[PDB]
């Protein structure tokens, strides 16, 4: 399988066997000798995917990584097919599609036993189950699914694909294992990921939208009912069935090649607003967008030189960028991103988590799927879900930046490049970031404290409010104004605004509001500065962990200690948590804090100044009656009018289909309190307690041969932070879900 | 309220706009392409500037000429 | 006496000496190199040692010792002739490492024994037996 | 646990509605909503967007105890060395910022010690515990008058 | 400075433009203060240049 | 002295700045500069 | 030598860098000629000028944002706030000098001594009180300043 | 702020003294004592 390519594989490097499955710890030479202490077990899980600590061959590591990628893709295919099958044979997708505005999207039926059958609440049309917030029904309606058999077929295809990915992983780790030369083709890999994966993907999805999503949805919104819509392929068998909806189809693909594109203005629109029937983005707009994105990505996938002389050498581009401030510039970065997996992982985790948070922010205010803006639970759930995914990916980006610093950083190849100079003024960077975090904390949280003290003393006129000392976010208001004036001027062909959150019509579907102008005042200014503050503190922790992983004034030989170590003794005043791993540990807490305040802001602002009902007068009555302005300026406001008030749904959820949310609420509280034990103590006390219990077992000859050892310091920290995040996020999950499911 | 295009390419859109953009891109490639005849597939003799050094150079420069020509056509068509 | 050697080729950093070097004390590492090489700076970033003699000033003794371990453990012709001194603001220089021209890892004659207890660990006197004194079990 | 039990049972006894405690103290959600959430309603309204009543100090002190408790968490979870490195960067900053160079510390700034950090985190934890529970106790029992 | 600031208030107090207004003495004070400020700047510039 | 033009508060302070502050400051800088006995 | 960032004072092993912000001609000339660093000055003159400037600008915050800003005593309140903050700053300066120059006195510069730092504190106190009072006096009499600037009394 | 109790002029000046003068004096004395000799 050469085909005059740059492919180079090894025909049989690893034999297939089952014997190593019976030796837990084969990948670690320190664990192969068998357990003697309980720590042996824990480390077996800690280094499972730590391929660098298993072998010093970059080629074998790349092969393990490739096959692990295939395995993870098989797992995600299995999960996606499970979701599709549960929508197929276990959901009310058809009863919902027949009448969305009067039925709740349900899935996952519970077996009636031990009382748990109560969780299958009535969702409409006689269906009993658990209301789902993932928004799968809206996505499937956007895709054009009409029959549950098609969800079943998608599940079958996904399971077939999962088997394919698993076979591919096995085949490329045991049969044809690609060489290290093949992975280092970053120019080719980039060309393909831009053109083949992204370009072709959006191109085919635009085609599917034009042939399946757009016609079916055009009819669906007009009330034609699902069972009366012809099948998606009857539109391909009958061109007149496509020309009746879009007369532009009657001219064929002749205007396309002749650049006569305007003819296609029937199905390739630039409406901008929302669909008045369902409250989602126009599928014509999404298809046009996918077409443009596909062309852009395909054109981008031609920049880099591969096997034909034409193209861009990324090494030459990086080395050609150097100025008076930065020395030799990006020289040596090609060698880093070609010989180091952790540098790539850090960059990609950072950008992917940012993209995920951007996805959350762009989907909450521009509802792309039909009838997703009406459902407040699904909106809030998707928002916070992508928020947390992005936060975790960013913390992991910091972790792997530090890992690269400790393991793959070579000072001999980083002589006066960007990384070298950053290491040479990290003190300035971190001191200024320290100051910026302090200035933000004083000038965001401190403003809330001022308001609390002034209101408590009976001095409302001395507060930072819209009615006293105003903090008007003038710039955001100006940009919103510019957005509301773009269609017709700075956006000539666009029919409406990009989003009504900046302003415009208060689009409402059914009895509820879909999207109205989101006003910004003093409380919004304060919350945005809280956001900046928390983001800065988290980034400070992570960046200091990365830059000081190799050395510091305290520990000039920190690199030799490794990336993951508890400390370097109680000397030098005390050196606990000096490692980069411990910086990731702290950045985890601060990411949790930042994202928690972000999602709380989202929930309260949407429920207060956006979400609500609309009576046949134009007048809007919001969920919690616009209390954001006068209450979100003090901490007591967030305690009373947000936490105390909106947790009434979660606490009184017993005896209904939401009692599980109260159960998980208490469970998250308990897991936070449980984490506190791992976070506040030390290993020595637990080892002494284990010594006493081991004596007690010696009294009756129940002493295990594997000596019980207390959790290591690093493991104690990992367990504590894992339980802390789990408990807090599950608490807010239950709270948000119950609240947004008990507001209509 | 759509941007007006042109249907048949006839004498204006083709030759006068598309082919001239292709020739401009061919000149820009012949001047600025670093590796011109480094492709694994070689071109047939030399002839003129319609195609001279390597099939990949001609293919890439025709693609860039098509980009330029589509842009200039949809521009002069008033958008 | 007078410390000799060329400073390593370095563009500068913010992790070097502070006011302590001139108010309190400073340290110096000297070493001979078989060629112009690149080493890692204990204060962050990379530097270039010259072929021949190299003299480098650092803020703390542990930094010089980290540089010494790196010289002796990370280069093809191992640099082990390095010397570490302590410099005072009066210009005084106190030779430090290796103390007796031989690394402390391996035994060498002429060295006295300090901090050596003739007894065992578990044979320390009970604290109550030495209370209301200025001593601890590991001191008498 | 002592004071929660005592206060919930005694609130029930004083209001004559011992049924609430006797029937809801069996599951922990009963404690979460009928004791903590409920008796807080008065306290958290000592001051609000509408004015101030006699529970303003108690609400403010409730939030004060929350703040002090979390600040204790700060010292308890994060351990010295990180802070010593941060303080080292801040020391670098001060020595190199003009005008402020006219001024120098008499004592070299260093991070709190390990035992000191435990003591300080625990001190904040205990201050917050006592103050927030005292605020809740007083405000609830006084706004209900038992 | 005591002697000079004391006597410099007079000229503008009795002969300045605000002498025939409700702000006569305030006008004199403002004039004398501005003059003493300029004089201080002159003295300081002199010191700066002659003792290098 | 008044002003119906926009931002007529600008001359109010700009005239003393252009007439007093800028001249005094620039003459002081130039006096110091032309009297500096550095090298030559 | 296209690089604009170099070692500080020709020593790459001192914890600093020479940058356009830290060690450029403009920064050297401006910072070096502020009253704190201007060559030849006596500590009391440095203190006087610094205090003048600080007492002057410290009038504003409480004048426009303090509790008496909405009263018939706005300017007086801003004045009082400025004077008290300057008194606390003066006590701080005096105490700093008291503890930092206890033993032998260096010969480098007069500011970095016990006597010199106390003289700088006296200058700061006097200048700060004076500048705060002149700012308050200008604000209280803004109407006569307005008539002076518009030629209303001609 | 007022007080129908007798000597209501006493807290008038006594609250600043306990809150400003006394703390400033004690903190200054203790600061000088902390940083004594050298
Ligand atoms: C993607 C992961 C995933 C997850 C989290 C679930 C989750 C669940 N499934 Mg599902 N399922 C999945 C994939 C998944 N499924 C796939 C890929 C298929 C296609 C083969 C199915 C087909 C399927 C069926 C047919 C049923 C479930 C059922 C269930 C529920 C009980 C499972 C059980 O106790 O079986 C048994 C457990 C052991 C043998 C141990 C449970 C909440 C049951 C259910 O929903 O009851 C109404 C059930 O009948 N699932
Ligand atoms: C057009 C060519 C092409 C395509 C589409 C891909 C696509 C992909 N690559 Mg690959 N790659 C390519 C060229 C291509 N690559 C070349 C030329 C090289 C050599 C330099 C590499 C070397 C490379 C490496 C080393 C790795 C990848 C990885 C990945 C996957 C990560 C992204 C992801 O998970 O998205 C979403 C996932 C999916 C949509 C699942 C579908 C996967 C199927 C099997 C591939 C697409 C179908 C196939 C093209 C047939 C289509 C026919 C029909 C549908 C029209 C992804 C599916 C990474 C990986 O394995 O991640 C798991 C990885 O480690 N690529
Ligand atoms: C594509 C993303 C990606 C990739 C491939 C890697 C890859 C790697 N990481 Mg990294 N990292 C990532 C994201 C990623 N990480 C993220 C998002 C974070 C933030 C949390 C981190 C933070 C991080 C740290 C702190 C460390 C690593 C480490 C490692 C290496 C060891 C893997 C391991 O620990 O074994 C297997 C993993 C485990 C045994 C952990 C299992 C714990 C589970 C997931 C608890 C979570 C609960 C679950 C989600 C829900 C509750 C269910 C429960 C009730 C049953 C490995 C090469 C380690 C290292 O030393 O690097 C060399 C290490 O110390 N990473
Ligand atoms: C509510 C709890 C809490 C609070 C108060 C703080 C406080 C702070 N943390 Mg921390 N943290 C916490 C929890 C908390 N943490 C926990 C649980 C952990 C464990 C994961 C951490 C771990 C952590 C790390 C790793 C870091 C911080 C950082 C910071 C500082 C950020 C800079 C700033 O905002 O400027 C100052 C803000 C304040 C001091 C807030 C209080 C301001 C009040 C309202 C004003 C007081 C008025 C007046 C002075 C009172 C006078 C009293 C009178 C009697 C004299 C800040 C002082 C970062 C840092 O150091 O910043 C650079 C940092 O790196 N934290
Ligand atoms: C003489 C050649 C020419 C002319 C007069 C135009 C004219 C125009 N172009 Mg075009 N364009 C050109 C060359 C030209 N272009 C080329 C060579 C390319 C390829 C890079 C493009 C790619 C391009 C894009 C991507 C877009 C335009 C757009 C536009 C219109 C919007 C102008 C604006 O300021 O906004 C405008 C009428 C915009 C448009 O079509 O408006 C909808 C727009 O989207 N042009
Ligand atoms: C932003 C920096 C700054 C600031 C806040 C001040 C502030 C002040 N200076 Mg100073 N000065 C500065 C920089 C500064 N200076 C520098 C760099 C120099 C060296 C050239 C001087 C040299 C200087 C002298 C010789 C004197 C002052 C004096 C004063 C006070 C009189 C008010 C005044 O001059 O109007 C405000 C000034 C400004 C808004 C512009 C400041 C920057 C320019 C370059 C200052 C130029 C000084 C100039 C020759 C004197 C002004 C003449 C006067 C009539 C205003 C005042 C509080 C006088 C004083 O009473 O000292 C005790 C005086 O004698 N300054
Ligand atoms: C909490 C932040 C804050 C707040 C709210 C204020 C508030 C205020 N500031 Mg301040 N300021 C601040 C921070 C702040 N400041 C900071 C950080 C700085 C830099 C250190 C300054 C520096 C500054 C200066 C230099 C001045 C103010 C002034 C003012 C007042 C102007 C309003 C006014 O009277 O309108 C109307 C406008 C006027 C009254 C202008 C006054 C006319 C001037 C004095 C004429 C001088 C020009 C002339 C050339 C003088 C040379 C004469 C010479 C030849 C003898 C106001 C109350 C002004 C003031 O105090 O007025 C007396 C003023 O002079 N501020
Ligand atoms: C420990 C006892 C104690 C306590 C906690 C208080 C509490 C208080 N007093 Mg009172 N006071 C006390 C004893 C006490 N008093 C006695 C015995 C007298 C008669 C001599 C007074 C006469 C007095 C007056 C006239 C006033 C107060 C006032 C006040 C309030 C503000 C403090 C102040 O400004 O006055 C300062 C207190 C004094 C000058 C009296 C000295 C206090 C005793 C004799 C010494 C306490 C020492 C004790 C060991 C504490 C040391 C600190 C500790 C860490 C060791 C405050 C709530 C003010 C008020 O009414 O608030 C509205 C006020 O006007 N007190
Ligand atoms: C209130 C109105 C006033 C607004 C003014 C605000 C701008 C002034 C401060 C901006 C900093 C300018 C320096 C960057 C411009 C810049 O990058 O210059 C370029 C320079 C490097 O350029 P080279 O010439 O080396 O380019 C060659 C490259 O190809 C090789 O790297 O970077 C530096 O000088 C390092 C210093 C960066 C450290 C400064 C960052 C500070 C963060 C600022 C955050 C504030 C805004 C954040 C919003 C997201
Ligand atoms: C522009 C600019 C800048 C800035 C500046 C600032 C930020 C500020 C300053 C300002 C200020 C801060 C000013 C001031 C002034 C002050 C004064 C002018 C004073 C005074 C005093 C007097 C006049 C007197 C008084 C008195 C006495 C002492 C005695 C008795 C009483 C009385 C009152 C008479 C710089 C250069 C940096 C850079 C460039 C640009
Ligand atoms: S307390 Fe634990 S982490 Fe800290 S120095 Fe001691 S052993 Fe190391
Ligand atoms: Ca007021
Ligand atoms: Ca007159
Ligand atoms: Cl409130």
PDB file of N, CA and C and ligand atoms in Angstrom, chain E residues 33 37, chain G residues 30 52-54 56-57 126 130-131 133-134, ligand 10:
ATOM      1  N   UNK E  33      -0.119  84.012  44.634  1.00  0.00           N
ATOM      2  CA  UNK E  33       0.208  82.591  44.698  1.00  0.00           C
ATOM      3  C   UNK E  33       0.824  82.116  43.388  1.00  0.00           C
ATOM      4  N   UNK E  37       4.605  80.687  42.842  1.00  0.00           N
ATOM      5  CA  UNK E  37       4.851  79.398  42.203  1.00  0.00           C
ATOM      6  C   UNK E  37       5.874  79.533  41.079  1.00  0.00           C
TER       7      UNK E  37
ATOM      8  N   UNK G  30      13.110  60.619  32.394  1.00  0.00           N
ATOM      9  CA  UNK G  30      11.894  60.999  33.102  1.00  0.00           C
ATOM     10  C   UNK G  30      11.940  60.544  34.559  1.00  0.00           C
ATOM     11  N   UNK G  52       3.128  68.053  47.438  1.00  0.00           N
ATOM     12  CA  UNK G  52       2.305  68.963  46.646  1.00  0.00           C
ATOM     13  C   UNK G  52       1.464  68.185  45.644  1.00  0.00           C
ATOM     14  N   UNK G  53       2.132  67.387  44.805  1.00  0.00           N
ATOM     15  CA  UNK G  53       1.420  66.644  43.766  1.00  0.00           C
ATOM     16  C   UNK G  53       0.389  65.687  44.362  1.00  0.00           C
ATOM     17  N   UNK G  54       0.763  64.971  45.425  1.00  0.00           N
ATOM     18  CA  UNK G  54      -0.114  63.927  45.944  1.00  0.00           C
ATOM     19  C   UNK G  54      -1.310  64.509  46.680  1.00  0.00           C
ATOM     20  N   UNK G  56      -2.530  67.325  46.124  1.00  0.00           N
ATOM     21  CA  UNK G  56      -3.367  67.919  45.094  1.00  0.00           C
ATOM     22  C   UNK G  56      -4.310  66.886  44.494  1.00  0.00           C
ATOM     23  N   UNK G  57      -3.774  65.746  44.046  1.00  0.00           N
ATOM     24  CA  UNK G  57      -4.647  64.816  43.331  1.00  0.00           C
ATOM     25  C   UNK G  57      -5.507  63.968  44.265  1.00  0.00           C
ATOM     26  N   UNK G 126       4.130  68.722  54.575  1.00  0.00           N
ATOM     27  CA  UNK G 126       3.819  70.120  54.291  1.00  0.00           C
ATOM     28  C   UNK G 126       3.248  70.264  52.884  1.00  0.00           C
ATOM     29  N   UNK G 130      -0.588  71.333  51.835  1.00  0.00           N
ATOM     30  CA  UNK G 130      -0.739  72.509  50.996  1.00  0.00           C
ATOM     31  C   UNK G 130      -1.447  72.220  49.686  1.00  0.00           C
ATOM     32  N   UNK G 131      -1.064  71.133  49.015  1.00  0.00           N
ATOM     33  CA  UNK G 131      -1.682  70.803  47.744  1.00  0.00           C
ATOM     34  C   UNK G 131      -3.142  70.432  47.889  1.00  0.00           C
ATOM     35  N   UNK G 133      -5.102  71.546  50.218  1.00  0.00           N
ATOM     36  CA  UNK G 133      -5.837  72.764  50.532  1.00  0.00           C
ATOM     37  C   UNK G 133      -5.994  73.652  49.304  1.00  0.00           C
ATOM     38  N   UNK G 134      -4.977  73.717  48.440  1.00  0.00           N
ATOM     39  CA  UNK G 134      -5.094  74.581  47.267  1.00  0.00           C
ATOM     40  C   UNK G 134      -6.068  73.982  46.259  1.00  0.00           C
TER      41      UNK G 134
HETATM   42  C1  LIG I  10       0.519  64.501  31.184  1.00  0.00           C
HETATM   43  C2  LIG I  10       1.590  63.451  31.159  1.00  0.00           C
HETATM   44  C3  LIG I  10       2.057  62.875  32.266  1.00  0.00           C
HETATM   45  C4  LIG I  10       1.184  62.733  33.451  1.00  0.00           C
HETATM   46  C5  LIG I  10       1.051  63.501  34.522  1.00  0.00           C
HETATM   47  C6  LIG I  10       0.132  63.257  35.654  1.00  0.00           C
HETATM   48  C7  LIG I  10      -0.522  61.913  35.758  1.00  0.00           C
HETATM   49  C8  LIG I  10      -0.132  64.195  36.592  1.00  0.00           C
HETATM   50  C9  LIG I  10       0.401  65.330  37.361  1.00  0.00           C
HETATM   51  C10 LIG I  10      -0.450  66.214  37.926  1.00  0.00           C
HETATM   52  C11 LIG I  10      -0.332  66.776  39.297  1.00  0.00           C
HETATM   53  C12 LIG I  10      -0.441  65.879  40.518  1.00  0.00           C
HETATM   54  C13 LIG I  10      -0.157  68.118  39.434  1.00  0.00           C
HETATM   55  C14 LIG I  10      -0.028  68.947  40.653  1.00  0.00           C
HETATM   56  C15 LIG I  10      -0.079  70.223  41.142  1.00  0.00           C
HETATM   57  C16 LIG I  10       0.136  70.584  42.549  1.00  0.00           C
HETATM   58  C17 LIG I  10       0.330  71.845  43.034  1.00  0.00           C
HETATM   59  C18 LIG I  10       0.355  73.070  42.148  1.00  0.00           C
HETATM   60  C19 LIG I  10       0.537  72.179  44.456  1.00  0.00           C
HETATM   61  C20 LIG I  10       0.478  73.179  45.340  1.00  0.00           C
HETATM   62  C21 LIG I  10       0.564  73.985  46.555  1.00  0.00           C
HETATM   63  C22 LIG I  10       0.346  75.316  46.662  1.00  0.00           C
HETATM   64  C23 LIG I  10      -0.039  76.150  45.479  1.00  0.00           C
HETATM   65  C24 LIG I  10       0.503  75.912  47.993  1.00  0.00           C
HETATM   66  C25 LIG I  10      -0.200  75.568  49.117  1.00  0.00           C
HETATM   67  C26 LIG I  10      -0.115  76.151  50.469  1.00  0.00           C
HETATM   68  C27 LIG I  10       0.944  75.947  51.255  1.00  0.00           C
HETATM   69  C28 LIG I  10       1.900  74.815  51.015  1.00  0.00           C
HETATM   70  C29 LIG I  10       1.278  76.841  52.432  1.00  0.00           C
HETATM   71  C30 LIG I  10       0.024  77.479  53.036  1.00  0.00           C
HETATM   72  C31 LIG I  10      -1.320  77.045  52.470  1.00  0.00           C
HETATM   73  C32 LIG I  10      -1.302  76.984  50.954  1.00  0.00           C
HETATM   74  C33 LIG I  10      -2.512  76.416  50.232  1.00  0.00           C
HETATM   75  C34 LIG I  10      -1.130  78.398  50.416  1.00  0.00           C
HETATM   76  C35 LIG I  10       3.486  62.340  32.297  1.00  0.00           C
HETATM   77  C36 LIG I  10       4.435  63.501  32.553  1.00  0.00           C
HETATM   78  C37 LIG I  10       3.579  61.301  33.408  1.00  0.00           C
HETATM   79  C38 LIG I  10       3.828  61.695  30.958  1.00  0.00           C
HETATM   80  C39 LIG I  10       3.557  62.631  29.786  1.00  0.00           C
HETATM   81  C40 LIG I  10       2.106  63.090  29.790  1.00  0.00           C
END
